[PDB]
Amino acid sequence: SVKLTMWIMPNSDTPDQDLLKVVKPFTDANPHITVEPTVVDWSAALTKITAAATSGEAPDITQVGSTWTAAIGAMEGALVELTGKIDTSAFVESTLQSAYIKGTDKMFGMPWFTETRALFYRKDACEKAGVNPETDFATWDKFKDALKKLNGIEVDGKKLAALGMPGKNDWNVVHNFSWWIYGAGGDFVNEEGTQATFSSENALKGIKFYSELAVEGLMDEPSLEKNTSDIESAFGDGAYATAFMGPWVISSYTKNKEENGNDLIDKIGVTMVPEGPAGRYAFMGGSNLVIFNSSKNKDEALELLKFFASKEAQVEYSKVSKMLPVVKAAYEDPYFEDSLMKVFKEQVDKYGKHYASVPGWASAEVIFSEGLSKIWDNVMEVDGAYSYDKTVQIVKDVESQINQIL
Ligand SMILES: OC[C@H]1O[C@@H](O[C@H]2[C@H](O)[C@@H](O)[C@H](O[C@H]3[C@H](O)[C@@H](O)[C@H](O[C@H]4[C@H](O)[C@@H](O)[C@H](O[C@H]5[C@H](O)[C@@H](O)[C@H](O)O[C@@H]5CO)O[C@@H]4CO)O[C@@H]3CO)O[C@@H]2CO)[C@H](O)[C@@H](O)[C@@H]1O
């Protein structure tokens, strides 16, 4: 008897039991192997994974955020190197970038799922404001003009803010700036991933354009004090005409209808992020699976990773989590005929950009979270009138620290 233990982040409504249903055919086929998952929240996941990779008190397998895989893989003796042990030919090729440490051929993670952030909108709000969501969100400029028509629009008995986005207290602070920086023609690092570059003229233009949506009254200011979880539920309760969100919110909005009679899920559509002056770019995220080097059952752990990469396991976890499969053949399933999900798939395939997979990037994300949130403090005028020059100073200070980290 072999007991495999697994750490997962909260990818679905009931994470441990949802995972156990997906792995049931594996444990039915292998009666000598059991799978025991434990949930670790996103806020503590980096610290807990790092400590486990060093101390030795570790599960066999853990989920790792795709942007963290290089940081954990670069710790000596932390992870099993997976090169040659996983057959990558079945995978969407773009998903492998985060599985390797950049500048090396070393693969320490297996892609498990991907995600992107798309533009959710209220159909009833758009029709009341005279906004055509087929065309009026296509570019930055048209998107901004649509927000002006949507700001304060009354639908049913209440007025909606045009755009609702979080500002603080999770990893999504940098993720939500990423594609505005890309769309402006900027980037976070140079091609080598050795030097920070997000204080460039273009990167600041994207930061300026996005953050000043709130200065101009089009983004709900109180929501900038809150985290992603708070703003997703606010959108599901009808507070905003639009919001940029991951696909997982569809699970929660569907449940709200089944449990509370909340009809929000029937009133929304999704489109790709507006195109900026650089062309269209989108945040590309997701998670990998890794095997700890301290595992006493690496062969069985490898069999489980291969199962998670199988076509049907990819389809089933996508159905419950709404995350995107990383295996090409999963998209032959009729489920991916859904109009909402197809937008996330088309966006990430054509326009998804992932951060440089460098060891210092996980540490940099902690720095971004703090620093980019000060830009929202500036916009919200908690300490004096808003000044773009203060934003410039904040980004310059963040850039210097990340350069030391890199
Ligand atoms: O930078 C690191 C890493 O980030 C990845 O992106 C992450 C992102 O960091 C996370 O913030 C995000 O977390 C979301 C979860 O994926 C999603 O499952 C979760 O869904 C919640 C739901 O919001 C919540 O309502 C629900 O509570 C229910 C209860 O379970 C019931 O008991 C109760 O009665 O009713 C409620 C209603 O459903 O629970 C679920 C699960 O907890 O919401 C999170 C956002 O708030 O996930 C992103 C993707 O993983 C990025 O992809 C990586 O590349 C990167 O490395």
Short mmCIF file of C-alpha atoms and ligand atoms in Angstrom, two decimals:
data_model
loop_
_atom_site.label_atom_id
_atom_site.label_comp_id
_atom_site.label_asym_id
_atom_site.label_seq_id
_atom_site.Cartn_x
_atom_site.Cartn_y
_atom_site.Cartn_z
CA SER A 1 0.00 0.00 0.00
CA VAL A 2 1.23 3.49 -1.14
CA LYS A 3 -0.31 6.68 0.25
CA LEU A 4 0.35 9.67 -2.00
CA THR A 5 -0.22 13.08 -0.41
CA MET A 6 -1.02 16.20 -2.43
CA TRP A 7 -1.09 19.88 -1.76
CA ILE A 8 -3.51 21.89 -3.86
CA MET A 9 -4.53 25.52 -3.88
CA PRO A 10 -8.28 26.34 -3.82
CA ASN A 11 -9.10 25.81 -7.49
CA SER A 12 -12.76 24.95 -7.09
CA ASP A 13 -15.69 25.44 -4.74
CA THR A 14 -14.90 22.39 -2.56
CA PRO A 15 -11.26 21.74 -3.45
CA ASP A 16 -10.41 18.45 -1.72
CA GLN A 17 -13.57 16.55 -2.68
CA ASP A 18 -13.58 17.96 -6.22
CA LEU A 19 -10.04 16.66 -6.69
CA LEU A 20 -10.94 13.26 -5.17
CA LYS A 21 -13.80 12.82 -7.72
CA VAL A 22 -11.36 13.54 -10.60
CA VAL A 23 -8.77 11.06 -9.26
CA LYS A 24 -11.32 8.33 -8.51
CA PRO A 25 -10.69 6.50 -11.83
CA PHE A 26 -6.97 6.51 -11.04
CA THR A 27 -7.47 5.03 -7.56
CA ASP A 28 -10.01 2.56 -8.96
CA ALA A 29 -7.44 1.41 -11.52
CA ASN A 30 -4.63 1.24 -8.92
CA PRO A 31 -5.99 -0.22 -5.66
CA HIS A 32 -2.51 -0.16 -4.07
CA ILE A 33 -2.32 3.66 -4.38
CA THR A 34 -4.37 6.15 -2.38
CA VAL A 35 -4.45 9.92 -2.90
CA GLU A 36 -4.91 12.35 0.01
CA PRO A 37 -5.17 16.04 -0.95
CA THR A 38 -4.81 18.96 1.45
CA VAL A 39 -5.70 22.56 0.56
CA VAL A 40 -3.25 25.43 1.01
CA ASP A 41 -4.51 28.98 0.50
CA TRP A 42 -2.85 31.15 -2.15
CA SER A 43 -1.61 33.73 0.37
CA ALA A 44 0.49 31.18 2.29
CA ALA A 45 1.33 28.80 -0.58
CA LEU A 46 4.72 30.26 -1.52
CA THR A 47 6.02 30.28 2.06
CA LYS A 48 4.65 26.79 2.77
CA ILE A 49 6.06 25.27 -0.43
CA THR A 50 9.46 26.90 0.09
CA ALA A 51 9.63 25.66 3.69
CA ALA A 52 8.59 22.14 2.66
CA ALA A 53 11.24 22.01 -0.09
CA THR A 54 13.92 22.76 2.54
CA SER A 55 12.74 21.20 5.80
CA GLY A 56 11.72 17.77 4.52
CA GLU A 57 8.22 17.72 6.00
CA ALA A 58 6.52 17.65 2.64
CA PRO A 59 3.84 15.87 0.61
CA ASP A 60 4.73 13.80 -2.43
CA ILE A 61 3.26 16.34 -4.87
CA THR A 62 2.21 19.97 -4.78
CA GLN A 63 0.47 22.38 -7.06
CA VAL A 64 2.67 25.41 -7.80
CA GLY A 65 1.58 28.65 -9.40
CA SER A 66 3.08 28.73 -12.90
CA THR A 67 4.93 31.96 -12.08
CA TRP A 68 6.58 30.31 -9.03
CA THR A 69 7.83 27.06 -10.58
CA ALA A 70 11.28 28.44 -11.43
CA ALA A 71 11.78 29.75 -7.89
CA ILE A 72 11.10 26.35 -6.33
CA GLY A 73 12.88 24.39 -9.05
CA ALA A 74 16.04 26.47 -8.64
CA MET A 75 16.39 25.49 -4.97
CA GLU A 76 18.98 22.72 -5.00
CA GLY A 77 17.57 19.26 -4.34
CA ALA A 78 14.04 20.63 -3.89
CA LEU A 79 12.17 19.10 -6.84
CA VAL A 80 12.41 16.05 -9.06
CA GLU A 81 13.68 17.11 -12.47
CA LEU A 82 10.98 15.94 -14.87
CA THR A 83 12.88 16.21 -18.17
CA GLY A 84 12.35 13.03 -20.16
CA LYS A 85 9.98 11.58 -17.55
CA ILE A 86 6.88 13.35 -18.91
CA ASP A 87 5.91 13.14 -22.59
CA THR A 88 5.38 16.82 -23.44
CA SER A 89 4.20 16.21 -27.03
CA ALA A 90 0.56 16.08 -25.85
CA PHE A 91 0.70 19.57 -24.31
CA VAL A 92 -0.19 22.99 -25.62
CA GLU A 93 3.37 24.11 -26.31
CA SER A 94 2.96 27.60 -24.82
CA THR A 95 2.17 26.04 -21.42
CA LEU A 96 5.65 24.48 -21.14
CA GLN A 97 7.48 27.82 -20.80
CA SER A 98 6.65 28.12 -17.10
CA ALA A 99 7.62 24.48 -16.48
CA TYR A 100 11.30 25.22 -17.25
CA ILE A 101 13.79 27.50 -15.55
CA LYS A 102 14.50 30.18 -18.15
CA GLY A 103 17.98 30.02 -19.64
CA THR A 104 18.15 26.29 -18.83
CA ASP A 105 16.75 23.10 -20.32
CA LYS A 106 15.69 21.93 -16.84
CA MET A 107 11.98 21.11 -16.42
CA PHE A 108 10.82 20.89 -12.80
CA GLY A 109 7.06 21.15 -13.27
CA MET A 110 4.31 19.59 -15.32
CA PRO A 111 1.63 21.94 -16.68
CA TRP A 112 -1.72 21.18 -15.08
CA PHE A 113 -4.06 24.00 -16.09
CA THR A 114 -3.92 27.52 -17.50
CA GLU A 115 -6.03 30.63 -17.05
CA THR A 116 -6.40 34.18 -18.31
CA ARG A 117 -8.44 37.21 -17.31
CA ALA A 118 -11.18 38.31 -19.70
CA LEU A 119 -13.65 41.19 -19.76
CA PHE A 120 -17.00 40.35 -18.16
CA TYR A 121 -19.92 42.66 -18.92
CA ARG A 122 -23.61 43.00 -18.09
CA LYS A 123 -25.75 42.66 -21.21
CA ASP A 124 -28.64 44.57 -19.63
CA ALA A 125 -26.33 47.41 -18.59
CA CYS A 126 -24.83 47.65 -22.08
CA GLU A 127 -28.23 47.73 -23.81
CA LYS A 128 -29.44 50.47 -21.45
CA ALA A 129 -26.30 52.55 -22.07
CA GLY A 130 -26.30 52.09 -25.84
CA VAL A 131 -23.07 50.08 -25.73
CA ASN A 132 -22.52 47.33 -28.30
CA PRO A 133 -20.31 44.75 -26.53
CA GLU A 134 -19.46 43.16 -29.89
CA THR A 135 -17.49 46.24 -31.02
CA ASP A 136 -17.33 48.89 -28.28
CA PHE A 137 -14.77 47.02 -26.12
CA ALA A 138 -12.35 46.28 -28.96
CA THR A 139 -9.69 48.92 -28.22
CA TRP A 140 -8.49 50.92 -25.22
CA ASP A 141 -10.10 54.08 -26.57
CA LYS A 142 -13.49 52.53 -27.35
CA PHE A 143 -13.40 50.65 -24.04
CA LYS A 144 -12.91 53.94 -22.19
CA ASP A 145 -15.75 55.61 -24.11
CA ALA A 146 -17.99 52.66 -23.22
CA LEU A 147 -17.18 53.05 -19.51
CA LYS A 148 -18.25 56.71 -19.72
CA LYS A 149 -21.65 55.61 -21.05
CA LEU A 150 -21.87 52.85 -18.43
CA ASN A 151 -20.77 54.88 -15.39
CA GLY A 152 -23.74 55.19 -13.06
CA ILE A 153 -26.17 53.45 -15.40
CA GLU A 154 -29.38 52.43 -13.65
CA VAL A 155 -30.40 48.80 -14.20
CA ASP A 156 -33.38 47.46 -12.25
CA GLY A 157 -33.37 49.75 -9.21
CA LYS A 158 -29.65 50.39 -8.70
CA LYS A 159 -26.83 52.31 -10.36
CA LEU A 160 -23.72 50.39 -11.39
CA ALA A 161 -20.15 51.57 -11.40
CA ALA A 162 -18.68 51.16 -14.88
CA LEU A 163 -15.72 48.99 -13.88
CA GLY A 164 -15.00 47.11 -10.67
CA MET A 165 -11.49 45.86 -9.91
CA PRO A 166 -9.59 44.94 -6.75
CA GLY A 167 -6.52 46.79 -5.61
CA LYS A 168 -4.92 45.03 -2.67
CA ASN A 169 -3.86 42.04 -0.66
CA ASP A 170 -3.30 39.17 -3.08
CA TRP A 171 -1.07 38.10 -5.96
CA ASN A 172 -3.48 39.48 -8.56
CA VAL A 173 -2.29 43.07 -8.03
CA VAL A 174 0.53 42.59 -10.54
CA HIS A 175 -1.50 40.20 -12.73
CA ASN A 176 -4.15 42.89 -13.23
CA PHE A 177 -1.54 45.45 -14.35
CA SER A 178 0.32 42.99 -16.59
CA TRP A 179 -1.66 43.22 -19.82
CA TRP A 180 -2.04 47.00 -19.55
CA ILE A 181 1.76 47.20 -19.49
CA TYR A 182 2.02 44.73 -22.38
CA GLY A 183 -0.67 46.53 -24.36
CA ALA A 184 1.14 49.84 -23.94
CA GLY A 185 4.29 48.30 -25.42
CA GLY A 186 6.11 47.64 -22.14
CA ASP A 187 7.35 44.63 -20.21
CA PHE A 188 8.50 43.74 -16.71
CA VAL A 189 11.96 42.42 -17.64
CA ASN A 190 14.34 42.37 -20.59
CA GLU A 191 14.56 39.44 -23.01
CA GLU A 192 17.06 37.66 -20.75
CA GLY A 193 14.91 38.17 -17.65
CA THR A 194 17.90 39.60 -15.77
CA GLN A 195 16.89 43.27 -15.47
CA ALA A 196 13.64 45.05 -14.59
CA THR A 197 12.20 47.26 -17.33
CA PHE A 198 8.70 48.30 -16.19
CA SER A 199 9.75 51.92 -15.58
CA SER A 200 10.15 52.34 -19.35
CA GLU A 201 8.21 55.06 -21.13
CA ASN A 202 5.77 52.50 -22.55
CA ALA A 203 5.26 50.57 -19.30
CA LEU A 204 4.41 53.78 -17.45
CA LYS A 205 1.94 54.67 -20.20
CA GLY A 206 0.01 51.46 -19.53
CA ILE A 207 0.17 51.95 -15.76
CA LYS A 208 -0.97 55.55 -16.23
CA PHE A 209 -3.85 54.66 -18.56
CA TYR A 210 -5.19 51.89 -16.33
CA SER A 211 -4.80 53.60 -12.95
CA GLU A 212 -6.28 56.86 -14.24
CA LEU A 213 -9.51 55.08 -15.19
CA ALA A 214 -10.18 55.38 -11.44
CA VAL A 215 -8.96 58.99 -11.24
CA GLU A 216 -11.48 59.89 -13.96
CA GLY A 217 -14.41 58.27 -12.13
CA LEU A 218 -14.84 55.14 -14.21
CA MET A 219 -13.51 52.57 -11.74
CA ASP A 220 -15.18 52.11 -8.43
CA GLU A 221 -12.82 53.65 -5.87
CA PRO A 222 -14.01 51.67 -2.79
CA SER A 223 -13.32 48.40 -4.61
CA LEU A 224 -9.64 49.34 -4.93
CA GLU A 225 -9.30 48.77 -1.17
CA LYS A 226 -10.52 45.17 -1.54
CA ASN A 227 -9.10 41.89 -2.82
CA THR A 228 -10.08 39.77 -5.81
CA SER A 229 -12.46 37.58 -3.79
CA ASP A 230 -14.38 40.64 -2.58
CA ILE A 231 -14.76 42.12 -6.06
CA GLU A 232 -15.78 38.86 -7.76
CA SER A 233 -18.68 38.42 -5.33
CA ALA A 234 -19.61 42.09 -5.70
CA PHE A 235 -19.88 41.58 -9.46
CA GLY A 236 -21.98 38.47 -8.85
CA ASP A 237 -24.32 40.60 -6.75
CA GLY A 238 -24.66 43.13 -9.58
CA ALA A 239 -22.41 45.99 -8.43
CA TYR A 240 -20.55 46.69 -11.70
CA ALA A 241 -21.20 46.87 -15.42
CA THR A 242 -17.80 45.30 -16.24
CA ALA A 243 -14.86 43.56 -14.56
CA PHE A 244 -11.73 41.65 -15.58
CA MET A 245 -11.89 38.20 -14.01
CA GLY A 246 -10.74 34.63 -14.37
CA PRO A 247 -12.99 31.86 -15.63
CA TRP A 248 -13.50 30.34 -12.17
CA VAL A 249 -16.09 32.98 -11.21
CA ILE A 250 -18.55 31.22 -13.54
CA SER A 251 -18.67 28.32 -11.06
CA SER A 252 -19.68 30.65 -8.24
CA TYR A 253 -22.23 32.63 -10.26
CA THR A 254 -23.86 29.39 -11.44
CA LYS A 255 -24.12 28.17 -7.84
CA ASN A 256 -25.68 31.50 -6.83
CA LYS A 257 -28.51 30.90 -9.28
CA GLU A 258 -29.11 27.34 -8.09
CA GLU A 259 -29.04 28.30 -4.40
CA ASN A 260 -30.25 31.91 -4.09
CA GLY A 261 -32.23 32.59 -7.27
CA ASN A 262 -29.56 35.11 -8.28
CA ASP A 263 -29.95 35.52 -12.05
CA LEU A 264 -26.62 37.33 -12.63
CA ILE A 265 -25.17 34.40 -14.62
CA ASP A 266 -27.92 34.83 -17.24
CA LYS A 267 -27.17 38.56 -17.65
CA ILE A 268 -23.45 38.48 -18.48
CA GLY A 269 -21.15 37.93 -21.41
CA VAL A 270 -17.39 37.76 -21.83
CA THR A 271 -15.07 39.24 -24.43
CA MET A 272 -11.34 39.54 -24.81
CA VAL A 273 -9.36 42.35 -23.19
CA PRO A 274 -9.32 45.58 -25.24
CA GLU A 275 -6.49 45.97 -27.73
CA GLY A 276 -3.83 48.54 -26.86
CA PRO A 277 -1.35 50.46 -29.01
CA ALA A 278 1.09 47.52 -28.95
CA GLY A 279 -1.57 45.08 -30.12
CA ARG A 280 -3.61 42.71 -28.00
CA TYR A 281 -1.93 41.00 -25.05
CA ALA A 282 -3.42 38.99 -22.21
CA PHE A 283 -2.25 37.68 -18.87
CA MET A 284 -1.32 34.00 -19.04
CA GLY A 285 -1.25 32.14 -15.74
CA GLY A 286 -2.04 28.69 -14.45
CA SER A 287 -0.49 26.06 -12.24
CA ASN A 288 2.00 23.24 -12.58
CA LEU A 289 2.40 20.04 -10.60
CA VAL A 290 5.76 19.15 -9.07
CA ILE A 291 7.19 16.20 -7.17
CA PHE A 292 9.26 16.92 -4.09
CA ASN A 293 12.73 15.41 -4.13
CA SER A 294 12.02 14.09 -0.61
CA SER A 295 9.22 11.81 -1.96
CA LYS A 296 9.71 8.12 -1.00
CA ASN A 297 7.27 7.12 -3.78
CA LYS A 298 8.41 9.01 -6.89
CA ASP A 299 7.34 6.29 -9.34
CA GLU A 300 3.74 6.30 -8.10
CA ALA A 301 3.82 10.10 -7.89
CA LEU A 302 4.89 10.13 -11.54
CA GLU A 303 1.97 7.85 -12.45
CA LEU A 304 -0.41 10.32 -10.80
CA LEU A 305 1.03 13.32 -12.67
CA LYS A 306 0.58 11.41 -15.92
CA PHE A 307 -3.04 10.74 -14.97
CA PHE A 308 -3.68 14.44 -14.36
CA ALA A 309 -2.30 15.03 -17.87
CA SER A 310 -4.62 12.44 -19.42
CA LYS A 311 -7.35 13.70 -21.74
CA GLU A 312 -10.30 12.82 -19.51
CA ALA A 313 -8.73 14.03 -16.27
CA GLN A 314 -8.06 17.35 -18.00
CA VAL A 315 -11.67 17.59 -19.19
CA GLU A 316 -13.14 16.69 -15.80
CA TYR A 317 -11.04 19.10 -13.75
CA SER A 318 -11.83 21.85 -16.27
CA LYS A 319 -15.57 21.22 -15.89
CA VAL A 320 -15.48 21.68 -12.12
CA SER A 321 -12.74 24.33 -11.80
CA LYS A 322 -13.35 26.27 -15.08
CA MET A 323 -9.56 26.34 -15.50
CA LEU A 324 -8.23 25.70 -18.99
CA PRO A 325 -6.69 22.35 -19.95
CA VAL A 326 -3.03 22.24 -20.97
CA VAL A 327 -3.46 19.09 -23.09
CA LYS A 328 -4.44 19.67 -26.72
CA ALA A 329 -6.77 16.66 -27.02
CA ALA A 330 -9.01 17.84 -24.15
CA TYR A 331 -10.43 20.55 -26.43
CA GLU A 332 -12.06 17.93 -28.66
CA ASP A 333 -14.66 17.41 -25.92
CA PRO A 334 -18.09 18.92 -26.68
CA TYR A 335 -18.00 20.78 -23.36
CA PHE A 336 -15.58 23.37 -24.86
CA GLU A 337 -18.36 24.44 -27.23
CA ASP A 338 -19.54 26.77 -24.46
CA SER A 339 -19.53 30.37 -25.64
CA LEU A 340 -17.98 31.79 -22.46
CA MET A 341 -15.15 29.28 -22.07
CA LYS A 342 -14.16 29.55 -25.75
CA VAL A 343 -13.31 33.23 -25.19
CA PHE A 344 -10.75 32.36 -22.51
CA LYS A 345 -9.22 29.67 -24.73
CA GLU A 346 -9.03 31.91 -27.80
CA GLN A 347 -7.56 34.79 -25.79
CA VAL A 348 -4.80 32.82 -24.10
CA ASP A 349 -3.83 30.96 -27.29
CA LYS A 350 -3.59 34.03 -29.51
CA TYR A 351 -2.50 36.70 -27.03
CA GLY A 352 -1.42 35.13 -23.73
CA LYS A 353 1.92 36.31 -22.36
CA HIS A 354 3.54 34.66 -19.33
CA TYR A 355 6.11 36.28 -17.05
CA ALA A 356 9.75 35.32 -17.42
CA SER A 357 10.24 31.97 -15.67
CA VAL A 358 13.22 33.11 -13.61
CA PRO A 359 14.02 32.07 -10.01
CA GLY A 360 13.63 35.54 -8.58
CA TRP A 361 10.15 36.09 -10.00
CA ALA A 362 8.23 34.63 -7.05
CA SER A 363 10.03 37.03 -4.70
CA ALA A 364 9.39 39.87 -7.16
CA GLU A 365 5.64 39.21 -6.99
CA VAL A 366 5.68 40.00 -3.26
CA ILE A 367 7.44 43.26 -4.15
CA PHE A 368 4.94 44.08 -6.91
CA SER A 369 1.97 43.41 -4.60
CA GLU A 370 3.21 45.97 -2.07
CA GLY A 371 4.39 48.56 -4.57
CA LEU A 372 1.65 48.55 -7.18
CA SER A 373 -0.92 48.77 -4.35
CA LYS A 374 0.66 52.14 -3.36
CA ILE A 375 -0.33 53.38 -6.79
CA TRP A 376 -3.93 52.68 -5.80
CA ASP A 377 -3.37 54.51 -2.50
CA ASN A 378 -2.15 57.44 -4.60
CA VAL A 379 -5.19 57.24 -6.91
CA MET A 380 -7.51 57.01 -3.90
CA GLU A 381 -5.88 60.13 -2.39
CA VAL A 382 -5.49 58.64 1.08
CA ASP A 383 -2.33 60.78 1.57
CA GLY A 384 -2.81 63.94 -0.49
CA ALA A 385 -4.05 64.73 -3.97
CA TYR A 386 -3.36 62.21 -6.74
CA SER A 387 -0.08 62.87 -8.63
CA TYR A 388 1.21 60.88 -11.59
CA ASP A 389 4.70 61.86 -10.52
CA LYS A 390 4.13 59.94 -7.28
CA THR A 391 3.21 56.91 -9.39
CA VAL A 392 6.48 57.35 -11.31
CA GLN A 393 8.42 57.52 -8.05
CA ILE A 394 6.72 54.37 -6.74
CA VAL A 395 7.50 52.40 -9.90
CA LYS A 396 11.12 53.61 -9.85
CA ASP A 397 11.49 52.40 -6.25
CA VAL A 398 9.91 49.03 -7.06
CA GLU A 399 12.16 48.63 -10.12
CA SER A 400 15.36 49.21 -8.13
CA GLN A 401 14.41 46.59 -5.54
CA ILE A 402 13.50 43.96 -8.16
CA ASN A 403 16.80 44.62 -9.93
CA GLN A 404 18.61 43.74 -6.69
CA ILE A 405 16.51 40.57 -6.42
CA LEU A 406 17.20 39.52 -10.01
O1 LIG B 1 0.78 34.66 -8.59
C1 LIG B 1 0.63 33.34 -8.11
C2 LIG B 1 -0.23 32.55 -9.04
O2 LIG B 1 -1.56 33.17 -9.10
C3 LIG B 1 -2.46 32.44 -10.06
O3 LIG B 1 -3.76 33.06 -10.14
C4 LIG B 1 -4.59 32.62 -9.06
C5 LIG B 1 -4.83 33.76 -8.10
O4 LIG B 1 -3.58 34.07 -7.40
C6 LIG B 1 -5.86 33.46 -7.08
O5 LIG B 1 -6.26 34.68 -6.42
C7 LIG B 1 -7.12 32.80 -7.64
O6 LIG B 1 -7.93 32.36 -6.54
C8 LIG B 1 -9.26 32.13 -6.98
C9 LIG B 1 -9.51 30.65 -7.01
O7 LIG B 1 -8.86 30.06 -8.17
C10 LIG B 1 -10.96 30.33 -7.07
O8 LIG B 1 -11.17 28.90 -7.01
C11 LIG B 1 -11.68 30.96 -5.89
O9 LIG B 1 -13.04 30.50 -5.89
C12 LIG B 1 -13.57 30.57 -4.57
C13 LIG B 1 -14.81 31.40 -4.65
O10 LIG B 1 -14.45 32.77 -4.98
C14 LIG B 1 -15.55 31.41 -3.37
O11 LIG B 1 -16.79 32.12 -3.58
C15 LIG B 1 -15.88 30.00 -2.90
O12 LIG B 1 -16.55 30.12 -1.62
C16 LIG B 1 -17.74 29.33 -1.63
C17 LIG B 1 -17.61 28.41 -0.45
O13 LIG B 1 -16.77 27.27 -0.81
C18 LIG B 1 -18.90 27.92 0.06
O14 LIG B 1 -18.70 27.10 1.23
C19 LIG B 1 -19.74 29.13 0.42
O15 LIG B 1 -20.86 28.76 1.10
O16 LIG B 1 -20.13 29.83 -0.85
C20 LIG B 1 -18.95 30.30 -1.60
C21 LIG B 1 -19.43 30.64 -2.98
O17 LIG B 1 -18.83 29.83 -3.96
O18 LIG B 1 -14.64 29.15 -2.80
C22 LIG B 1 -13.86 29.15 -4.05
C23 LIG B 1 -12.58 28.41 -3.77
O19 LIG B 1 -12.03 28.86 -2.56
O20 LIG B 1 -11.56 32.45 -5.97
C24 LIG B 1 -10.15 32.88 -5.97
C25 LIG B 1 -10.10 34.34 -6.27
O21 LIG B 1 -10.71 35.02 -5.20
O22 LIG B 1 -6.81 31.67 -8.57
C26 LIG B 1 -5.91 32.11 -9.64
C27 LIG B 1 -5.67 30.94 -10.55
O23 LIG B 1 -5.19 29.85 -9.81
C28 LIG B 1 -1.83 32.37 -11.44
O24 LIG B 1 -2.67 31.57 -12.30
C29 LIG B 1 -0.47 31.77 -11.40
O25 LIG B 1 0.11 31.86 -12.73
C30 LIG B 1 0.42 32.47 -10.43
O26 LIG B 1 1.66 31.77 -10.34
#
